[PDB]
Homo-oligomer: A and B are copies of this chain.
Amino acid sequence: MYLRITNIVESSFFTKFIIYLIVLNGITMGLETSKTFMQSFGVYTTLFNQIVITIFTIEIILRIYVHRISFFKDPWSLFDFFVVAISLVPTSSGFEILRVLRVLRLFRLVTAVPQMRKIVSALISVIPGMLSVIALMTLFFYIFAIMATQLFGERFPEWFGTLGESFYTLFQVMTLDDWSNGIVRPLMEVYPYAWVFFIPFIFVVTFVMINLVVAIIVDAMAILNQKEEQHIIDEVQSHEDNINNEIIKLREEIVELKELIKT
């Protein structure tokens, strides 16, 4: 029976039908936004929602028997899995956050549609090279968050009270969000020199972001000229000393013609 289900999971009808259920379920996810619509139709869509989660788990289990292990070595399939698992947690209780994370299920449309995975893939690819810089930055934030909390916390607690208080505030400053009328000018009333802290924080952070981008584009170029030079260097050494194997059978031949002297 294994091959019998495998023909299904792999059909064009399967993926389209699941893509189809993703999409319209998405539309219902959106209609539950309206409190008006939720009245005249609430039980309809929650029903619908239960049908979709059913079909999805059906599907996901099928996919597992058809792919087992390979399935769990697949980033994309793990996603659908966890994102479906979440939806499978009951419409209940105090930790009511999960009712809302059920709208993550719509990200299946990203898994289900190949054009889109490529985009997500292309995006993630940039990340691992950056993990070093991310560390350095987070270190830099940490160190400055500490100083903030200490230098500024007592008189300005909404902003620099806790450690995490200052983290949030320093993120805002980085996005240059209302940074000067909004935070530093207040600070400077008590502590006139605050700028000696915030002006450098701004230049370093902005500096790094910008440059990091420059480096990315330019280093990527550097490897493109690499493969190109290779490809062309590979040519002058494919030719030339293949025109060497022919200018020495001039040589072998030229000296094959050297008992002109015997006569």
What 0/1 readout, one digit per residue, does chain A (67-95) give for beta carbons within 8 Å of chain B?
A: 00000000000000000000000000000
The answer, among B151, B178, B228, for a CB contact under 8 Å with A100, is B151
* Chain B residue at minimal CB-CB distance from A218: B220
> Are B258 and A261 in contact (CB-based, < 8 A)?
no
The answer to whether A178 touches B175 (Cβ under 8 A) is no
Neighbouring B residues of A261 by C-beta, 8 Å: 259-260
Within 8 A of B (CB), among A214-263: 214-218, 220-222, 224-226, 228-229, 231-233, 235-237, 239-244, 246-251, 253-261, 263
Contact of A163 among B33, B177, B202, B224 (CB under 8 A): B33
Q: Would A139 and B119 count as touching, CB distance under 8 A?
A: no
- Among residues of B, the one whose C-beta sits closest to the C-beta of A250 is B251
Q: A120 at the A/B interface (Cβ < 8 Å)?
A: yes
Whether B217 pairs with A214 at a CB distance below 8 angstroms is yes
With a cutoff of 8 Å between Cβ atoms, the chain B residues found around residue A9 in the complex are: none
Asked whether B216 lies within 8 Å of A214 as measured between CB atoms, the reply is yes
A139 to B231, CA, bound (A): 40
Given contacts A175-B176, A217-B217, 18 further A-B contacts (CB under 8 A): A30-B146, A33-B150, A34-B162, A97-B151, A171-B199, A176-B176, A177-B181, A178-B178, A181-B183, A224-B225, A225-B225, A225-B228, A232-B236, A237-B239, A246-B247, A250-B251, A253-B258, A259-B261
* Nearest 8 pairs of A and B residues by beta carbon: A239-B240, A257-B257, A172-B180, A218-B220, A33-B163, A243-B244, A235-B236, A225-B228
